[PDB]
Amino acid sequence: SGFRKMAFPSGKVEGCMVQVTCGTTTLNGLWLDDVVYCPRHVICTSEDMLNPNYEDLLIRKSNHNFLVQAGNVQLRVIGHSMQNCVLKLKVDTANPKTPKYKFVRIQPGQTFSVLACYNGSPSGVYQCAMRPNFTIKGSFLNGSCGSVGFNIDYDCVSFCYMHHMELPTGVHAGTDLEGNFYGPFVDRQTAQAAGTDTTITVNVLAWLYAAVINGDRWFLNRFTTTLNDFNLVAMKYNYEPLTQDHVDILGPLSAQTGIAVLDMCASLKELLQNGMNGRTILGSALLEDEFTPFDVVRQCSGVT
Amino acid sequence: SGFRKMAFPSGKVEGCMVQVTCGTTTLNGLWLDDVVYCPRHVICTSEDMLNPNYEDLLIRKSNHNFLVQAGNVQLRVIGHSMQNCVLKLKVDTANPKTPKYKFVRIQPGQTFSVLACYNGSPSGVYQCAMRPNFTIKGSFLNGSCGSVGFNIDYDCVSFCYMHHMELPTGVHAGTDLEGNFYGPFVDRQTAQAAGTDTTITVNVLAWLYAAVINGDRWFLNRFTTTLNDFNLVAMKYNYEPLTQDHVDILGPLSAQTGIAVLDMCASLKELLQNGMNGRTILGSALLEDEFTPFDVVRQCSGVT
Numbered sequence: 001s002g003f004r005k006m007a008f009p010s011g012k013v014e015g016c017m018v019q020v021t022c023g024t025t026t027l028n029g030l031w032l033d034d035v036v037y038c039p040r041h042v043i044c045t046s047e048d049m050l051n052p053n054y055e056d057l058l059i060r061k062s063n064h065n066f067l068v069q070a071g072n073v074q075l076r077v078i079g080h081s082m083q084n085c086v087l088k089l090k091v092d093t094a095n096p097k098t099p100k101y102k103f104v105r106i107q108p109g110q111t112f113s114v115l116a117c118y119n120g121s122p123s124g125v126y127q128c129a130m131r132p133n134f135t136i137k138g139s140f141l142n143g144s145c146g147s148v149g150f151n152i153d154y155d156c157v158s159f160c161y162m163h164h165m166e167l168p169t170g171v172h173a174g175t176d177l178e179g180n181f182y183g184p185f186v187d188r189q190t191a192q193a194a195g196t197d198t199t200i201t202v203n204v205l206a207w208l209y210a211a212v213i214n215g216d217r218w219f220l221n222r223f224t225t226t227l228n229d230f231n232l233v234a235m236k237y238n239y240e241p242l243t244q245d246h247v248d249i250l251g252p253l254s255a256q257t258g259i260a261v262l263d264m265c266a267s268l269k270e271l272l273q274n275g276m277n278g279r280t281i282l283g284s285a286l287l288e289d290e291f292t293p294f295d296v297v298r299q300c301s302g303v304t
Numbered sequence: 305s306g307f308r309k310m311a312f313p314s315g316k317v318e319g320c321m322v323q324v325t326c327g328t329t330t331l332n333g334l335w336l337d338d339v340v341y342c343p344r345h346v347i348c349t350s351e352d353m354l355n356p357n358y359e360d361l362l363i364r365k366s367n368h369n370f371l372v373q374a375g376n377v378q379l380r381v382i383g384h385s386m387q388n389c390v391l392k393l394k395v396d397t398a399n400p401k402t403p404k405y406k407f408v409r410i411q412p413g414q415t416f417s418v419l420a421c422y423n424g425s426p427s428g429v430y431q432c433a434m435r436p437n438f439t440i441k442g443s444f445l446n447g448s449c450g451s452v453g454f455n456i457d458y459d460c461v462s463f464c465y466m467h468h469m470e471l472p473t474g475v476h477a478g479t480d481l482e483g484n485f486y487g488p489f490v491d492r493q494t495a496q497a498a499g500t501d502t503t504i505t506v507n508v509l510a511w512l513y514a515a516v517i518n519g520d521r522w523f524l525n526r527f528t529t530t531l532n533d534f535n536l537v538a539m540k541y542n543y544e545p546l547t548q549d550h551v552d553i554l555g556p557l558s559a560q561t562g563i564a565v566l567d568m569c570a571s572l573k574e575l576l577q578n579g580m581n582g583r584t585i586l587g588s589a590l591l592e593d594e595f596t597p598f599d600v601v602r603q604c605s606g607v608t
């Protein structure tokens with residue numbers, strides 16, 4: 001029993017983190033097989049970051065200008081190609097600790113673990129969500145760029161995020177491992193403002209199921225509702241619309257708890273309309289939206 | 305920028321997790337050098353757990369009755385001794401992945417990472433605190449016993465917790481690695497009720513410093529207070545008393561922020577007396593007490 005914001009074990013990813021240095025800029029890289037992945041803005045001075053022409057900047061760089069260090073051993077760079085907003089540095093040694101892996105572009109509302117790194121060294125690990133406005137609310141200081149987000153499926157690591165940017169508003173933007181930014185963000189130091197940070201409604205409902213399962217039940221009401229009724233209320237509170245797909249995904253939690261999904265929606269509606277009145281749910285005073293229904297099934301069943 | 309509930313990288317600890325089976329009971333063990341540490345209630349049937357005489361139960365057990373599996377390779381048990389509420393199983397092989405380590409008995413209010421395991425396999429990692437009533441609010445299902453709490457100091461892992469018990473109230477009790485329970489708890493299935501779960505006041509203040517540092521400032525008031533005045537208010541709200549030691553520990557955050565510790569106390573006093581009025585601080589609607597001042601210095605400085 002008990003319900004925690006829980007990251008995946010980071011060890012498989014620790015074993016992939018390296019330091020990448022280009023001139024004066026040092027940041028993190030991901031060593032998988034004989035390729036090191038890192039943000040292409042490694043080739044930028046902070047001055048460059050105002051109006052960087054990455055192709056032009058790259059002409060001046062050789063393989064020997066990219067210093068790649070895995071612990072205290074240097075990796076030889078034998079090639080590099082810019083793929084979108086990532087550099088792929090080919091090195092002459094395959095990472096002996098390469099786990100089984102995929103690159104997956106996640107959808108907004110999807111959760112993942114971040115291993116925050118500095119100089120190719122892990123500082124810590126925490127569970128995030130891709131917000132509906134394609135930002136993440138990370139913890140990232142200077143040197144954290146190249147820090148990655150991942151999921152683990154038994155022994156396969158699916159890398160979904162590489163950290164690139166902090167917006168002037170202190171939220172974070174980055175890419176998939178093909179170097180495509182999530183949302184409208186670019187690796188430029190400029191006015192980029194995130195859209196509305198909506199609540200991930202399906203994740204809130206899953207978390208309400210996790211609460212009931214762990215004994216926090218005070219918020220269960222006598223009411224039900226409909227998707228359309230629920231959604232009129234959701235929208236007014238900057239919650240994402242709930243779809244039949246969302247209802248289908250919550251099915252198992254519904255079955256296990258014997259609480260219909262629309263009944264729970266109607267519990268959630270009253271919480272929105274009436275607030276918590278100083279009460280808490282799994283030790284939170286607001287409605288948590290960074291657990292997916294899969295996260296809730298996983299942690300309430302003990303998947304390893 | 306940004307502030308996250310952040311666990312240590314779990315990889316050094318992943319490499320120590322094994323499965324221990326005695327008859328029908330399977331749970332987790334910690335393999336360091338040629339010793340595997342696990343909860344002594346591995347020798348108990350759920351029936352035993354009502355009124356277990358561990359010495360008597362142990363007479364009937366041989367080295368060959370303790371099945372120790374590290375991945376899919378069995379470890380030979382060549383000896384075992386009961387030390388308090390832990391079994392130490394001597395095995396003929398030293399764990400090749402043994403990191404630098406200590407056993408440290410932590411104080412209440414101290415934070416640590418848990419690597420939740422099932423059958424010697426890590427499921428996830430999360431940051432806890434030892435509550436002032438010596439419970440932790442964990443996430444632990446059947447088979448999680450032997451899951452450990454730790455801190456990392458660069459490359460040294462200080463193991464502080466081994467998980468043993470869930471109280472009837474769904475909070476967790478366990479031991480240091482010498483097998484001494486934190487607080488008044490025993491490995492018996494009975495009426496054990498935790499005391500008052502007080503708020504770790506020094507941790508709240510550190511978190512208020514982390515907020516200011518990350519730009520959340522709305523709660524900064526024009527007032528100051530004194531330790532005695534603050535404490536009259538603290539006590540009424542089931543906050544731990546604040547001591548000069550606590551003030552001394554907050555010194556660096558005070559220096560960095562230029563907010564005197566007693567000024568921040570007086571901000572915290574108004575928060576207690578006036579609530580949040582529907583506002584949030586680092587995306588929380590209550591006052592977080594599971595970051596130590598050291599945690600706040602660490603994450604705001606990027607220690608690896």
Ligand SMILES: CN1CCN(C(=O)Nc2ccccc2)CC1
Pocket residue numbers: 058078079080081082090
């Ligand atoms: C911008 N360019 C792109 C091409 N390029 C390479 O090095 N390519 C390469 C890739 C894999 C192995 C060997 C060489 C130089 C920089």
Ligand SMILES: CN1CCN(C(=O)Nc2ccccc2)CC1
Pocket residue numbers: 362382383384385386394
């Ligand atoms: C309860 N007893 C305690 C003694 N004991 C041992 O095996 N001790 C041992 C320790 C280290 C190496 C070899 C033997 C049996 C069970």
